[PDB]
Amino acid sequence: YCAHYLIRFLKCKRDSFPNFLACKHERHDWDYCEHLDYVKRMKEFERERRLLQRKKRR
Amino acid sequence: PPLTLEGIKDRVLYVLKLYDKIDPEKLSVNSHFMKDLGLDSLDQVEIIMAMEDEFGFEIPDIDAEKLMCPQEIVDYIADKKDVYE
Amino acid sequence: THQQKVLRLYKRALRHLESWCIHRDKYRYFACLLRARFDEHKNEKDMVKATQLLREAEEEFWHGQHPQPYIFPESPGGTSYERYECYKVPEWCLDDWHPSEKAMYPDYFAKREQWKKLRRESWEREVXXXXXXXXXXXXXXXXXXXXXXXXXXXXXXXXXXXXXXX
Amino acid sequence: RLFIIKPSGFYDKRFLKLLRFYILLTGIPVAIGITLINVXXXXXXXXXXXXXXXXXXXXXXXXXXXX
Amino acid sequence: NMFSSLSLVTLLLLTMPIMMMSFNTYKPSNYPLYVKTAISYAFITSMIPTMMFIH
Amino acid sequence: XXXXXXXXXXXXXXXXXXXXXXXXXXXXXXXXXXXXXXXXXXXXXXXXXXXXXXXXXXXXXXXXXXXXXXXXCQEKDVLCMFEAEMQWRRDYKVDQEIVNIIQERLKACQQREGESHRQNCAKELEQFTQVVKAYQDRYXXXXXXXXXXXXXXXXXXXXXXXXXXXXXX
Amino acid sequence: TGFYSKDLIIEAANTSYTNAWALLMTLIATSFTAIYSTRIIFFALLGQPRFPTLVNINENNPLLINSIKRLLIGSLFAGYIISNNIPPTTIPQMTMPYYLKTTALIVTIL
Amino acid sequence: XXXXXXXXXXXXXXXXXXXXXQAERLAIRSRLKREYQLQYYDPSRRGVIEDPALVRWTYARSANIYPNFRPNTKTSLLGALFGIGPLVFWYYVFKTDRDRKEKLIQEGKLDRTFNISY
Amino acid sequence: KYIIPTIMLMPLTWLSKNNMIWVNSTAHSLLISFTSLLLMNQFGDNSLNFSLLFFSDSLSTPLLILTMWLLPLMLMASQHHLSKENLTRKKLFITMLISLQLFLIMTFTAMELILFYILFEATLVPTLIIITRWGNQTERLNAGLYFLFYTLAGSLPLLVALIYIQNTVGSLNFLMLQYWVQPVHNSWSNVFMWLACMMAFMVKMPLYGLHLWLPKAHVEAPIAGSMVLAAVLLKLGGYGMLRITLILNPMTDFMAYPFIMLSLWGMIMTSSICLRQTDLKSLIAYSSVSHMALVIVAILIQTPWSYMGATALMIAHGLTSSMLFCLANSNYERIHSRTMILARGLQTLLPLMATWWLLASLTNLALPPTINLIGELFVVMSTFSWSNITIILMGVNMVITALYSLYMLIMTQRGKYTYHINNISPSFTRENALMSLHILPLLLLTLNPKIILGPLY
């Protein structure tokens, strides 16, 4: 789903070397796109809840 | 560490001296708890249990009545746990 | 016997007390409380009242009977090494050792041979002394002690000699 | 020092010595079996030509001892 | 090529006391120490292919 | 070689750009152990291969083909049946190891892809499903233990189903 | 080295279509770990000594020092070597900062 | 088997009959021990002692088979239902599974395509 | 090649002097057993006939090698016994083993059914004389009569079975000629034709019903423990079930269905009794019922996978149960009673024999692939193709397979031995050699078990 920013995490892993723990810039990208994707999934559930209230009035 | 025959008698006498119920001057080693020392019928079971806690814990129910004297109890505990060679 | 049944229960009650309490100072507090409970009935001798208390002694004790009691180290039954740590070797296997290997360390073999010769000679005298005891059936409860001082060895010789060493 | 628990031992240790002495006696052809692969060639995969079907060994691959 | 060769070394090192168990050479009191020394070098030979796996 | 398909070629090339460090632990150990005892093992193998010199060619594979099939000769007679029964048992023993090669082709696919597993390959998956289904119908797999005389009845059972179904449609 | 093994499962378990009763039962067990771990310290190690036997010898041996001290490297650096080097698949930490993420750490404290 | 309260020290009285009852138990206990004492404590033996009680224990299962069973009654027939009975129990289990399988081979195939072993 | 040097063992024992005997009988037998492996193993696609029909080739029988393996081993453990009695009596009961070896070779080699039958029942005669004599305990006759009146009562129906086939359908003879055989039409008249061929092999291969033939033969010991190995050979001596079911009745398996169900209950109930039993020899005697019951299940399925497990278990059990009886004999020669509870003490008194006790016990269970993992597991895998329910019953049996072995271990692994004063020497050089000659051939089968299971393998 993320695709673009998720591929950047593998780029840091490709040239990782000894002491591979020091990679924060690529790890932050995975926490940005997936959080927006989870919010988009939450927005779809909120839209269904709002539609049920309008349908009950008619 | 191995246990000595002279050391085991001194260890048993040290625990009996700090018992508070029995006098340190009246009884030493040769004097029996049954007649010489002022000990109750229920008191002998409590004194034998405390002696087992310090050394190797082994006390039979049938052999509890036979052991009363501190000199006899020190020999019975050493023989059962295999001591002095 | 009435005296033995009280002592057997009192010995169990003290060792079962340290399972409930954690600290040794709290153990001594409850130990004095148990003494006051039994001394009230110990003052007078009874045939009906004391026997009623003996069956009553099983109650209360059985209500708190299983908190997994402590047997401490190597104890008859219980937990944590009852027959373990001591594998041991029988005395019959000692004489079974073949030559060449038996030649190594001759101090242990020669001393054991002297004790074996003494045990063989005393066996004939011990057999007559065992049947000399007045019963005229076979035996009564426990084995009888030696009367003779010159011959020595009270009935059994291999009972105490050569057992087990940890 | 103690006399300790005694076993038979003499009959027991002798059997293991008598067993291994006859393993070692026929342990020589085991040592030759390694050198048979080392010195002599085992087998090579090759297509057969129409001349002879079987000679000494008919069809055997791997180990000279098989042939 | 080194990955395949070094992998079997860890398997062979643990079987070497079993190969020397059946008499072979006499070892008094040194046999408990022989197990310690066999596994000590077995750890170093197993560390390299795991480092290869990260790469 | 030849019979076994497998992958064409593997890439495998290291770049090493990020971090200086001590070059690489994997690369340094590979170069060191190649000359330590791997070079000595290659020299000892070459010394024994050259020491052979003279070698026998040998026939290896035997011929013997057809010699009349079992579904051509009938009636209980030892003179005709024995040659036919040996032919069917020859085919059955080979077909047990034919499947093994095709099975090993599927074994080779699983390791080489790993993450892909069932997403790719497809050729080895289709080849295995075609042979095993044919092996189940023709070479017993349902009609008890191996017998050449019972095999003709097994072939007749499959032929009877083909004649009955096609006639209706 | 607890967060690098135990806490990653708890955070991942909350975001699923799976059974609710199974999820609630695991949360009690994560807080239950603190009881028996302290029952080694507070019950036996900590406080006044119970005194098991009169004159008991306890000393550190040369073989003991070389074993325990070198085990400390494995028990501390496990969340540095194993967790970082191994390539993962799909990140679980995203939703619920107080309900799912904090609940794994708060259970050990409570 | 266990009751409401575990039997260990429950219900005990001194009396007169119970005092002689323990005397009867020790009379046999000491008698059988002394004959063991005379056999164990001598170097002249070398061997395994017989003991008539242990031989009769092995004889209880290895023998005394056909001297018994002469009163069959209804207890023997109940044991037959627990023996020959369960053999007839699986007859309506294995056949029903086989009839389920045999119908699938002829019509509506259920067997896997990647099956070749046996 | 096989017969004739075996017959020459008879004048060997009689002509040799009284001081020797045992040296000549054991050494000469070992070199004949080496030559059996030298020639018999060679086979093509279908195993071609040896010579004229007197003794023929092996098609799916590596079990002949096992008979050659026990050919010297049936003399090693019998050394402790027979030595007290007359020199003429010693020579007689070595030659009865030679006669057993003579007839046992003839059964597995000769590819027949007509002449095989008069070798099948011919093994019963030397064993009868062996069992009825030298028995230390009583009821020799309450086991000796039961030895024949179980077997001969079931095997005499082969005379009305086998002859009936050759009178109608060509001739039985070579078996390589036996392709004249047409499938049975399955009728009420054809019921007793199938039963008569089976009931003969239903006795020698013990089930749940008519199984009491085996424990009576084992508990009441013939001579020491070496003759009990020949009683193991009689179980696998009924191997013709591999040949009859495949050739004579291929279509008939509907009537096999109740007999599988009988043998399936001869797995739980036969194992349950093998737990609380007193005799050490009896706890091998009832475990041998269930282990050979696995083979009977495999035969009646008729799947190609099951015969692989069937042929493996014949060799697997033939060298594991015989190994267990030698351990039972080693305690019987020292304690002089077959009681498990009384004879208690391993490692402390028997230091090196206890490791042989462990290796023999664990082989009954599924160890790393020796022979029993290739034996037992192959049958369990084949039973699922028959029916899905089987492993629910067969899995319970896999729990109690430990309960034969470990219960035999634990009840001897207590280092008390207070009553016992005997067993000074742990084991003689021959006694430890017996234990090695049973397990080490199975340990060599780990590398190549092709000569352990081969019906079209």
Coordinates of C-alpha atoms in Angstrom, one line a residue, chain B residues 41-46 49 59-62 64-65, chain C residues 1-18 27 34-35 37-38 50-65, chain H residues 8-12:
Chain B
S41 CA 7.0 -33.9 77.7
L42 CA 6.1 -31.6 74.8
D43 CA 9.4 -29.7 75.2
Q44 CA 11.6 -32.5 74.0
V45 CA 10.0 -32.6 70.5
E46 CA 10.7 -28.8 70.0
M49 CA 13.5 -30.2 65.8
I59 CA 14.7 -37.2 62.6
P60 CA 12.6 -40.4 62.7
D61 CA 9.3 -40.5 64.6
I62 CA 10.0 -43.9 66.2
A64 CA 12.4 -39.5 68.7
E65 CA 11.4 -41.2 72.0
Chain C
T1 CA 0.2 -45.9 73.8
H2 CA -1.3 -42.5 74.5
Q3 CA 2.0 -40.7 75.1
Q4 CA 3.5 -41.6 71.6
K5 CA 0.4 -40.4 69.7
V6 CA 0.6 -36.9 71.1
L7 CA 4.4 -36.6 70.4
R8 CA 4.0 -37.8 66.8
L9 CA 1.3 -35.1 66.1
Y10 CA 3.3 -32.4 67.9
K11 CA 6.4 -33.1 65.9
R12 CA 4.4 -32.9 62.6
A13 CA 2.7 -29.6 63.7
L14 CA 6.0 -27.7 64.2
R15 CA 7.4 -28.7 60.8
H16 CA 4.0 -28.0 59.1
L17 CA 4.0 -24.5 60.8
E18 CA 7.0 -23.2 58.8
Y27 CA 7.6 -18.8 63.5
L34 CA 0.7 -23.9 70.3
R35 CA 2.4 -24.7 73.7
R37 CA -3.1 -24.9 73.8
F38 CA -1.8 -28.3 74.7
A50 CA -8.0 -36.9 76.4
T51 CA -8.9 -39.5 73.7
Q52 CA -11.7 -37.2 72.4
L53 CA -9.1 -34.4 72.0
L54 CA -6.8 -36.8 70.1
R55 CA -9.5 -37.2 67.4
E56 CA -10.2 -33.5 67.6
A57 CA -6.5 -32.8 66.9
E58 CA -6.9 -34.2 63.4
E59 CA -9.5 -31.4 62.7
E60 CA -8.2 -27.8 62.2
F61 CA -4.9 -29.4 61.2
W62 CA -6.6 -31.0 58.1
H63 CA -8.3 -27.8 57.1
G64 CA -4.8 -26.3 56.4
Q65 CA -3.0 -29.5 55.5
Chain H
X8 CA -4.0 -41.4 57.5
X9 CA -4.7 -40.8 61.2
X10 CA -8.6 -40.7 61.1
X11 CA -10.5 -42.7 63.7
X12 CA -8.2 -44.2 66.3

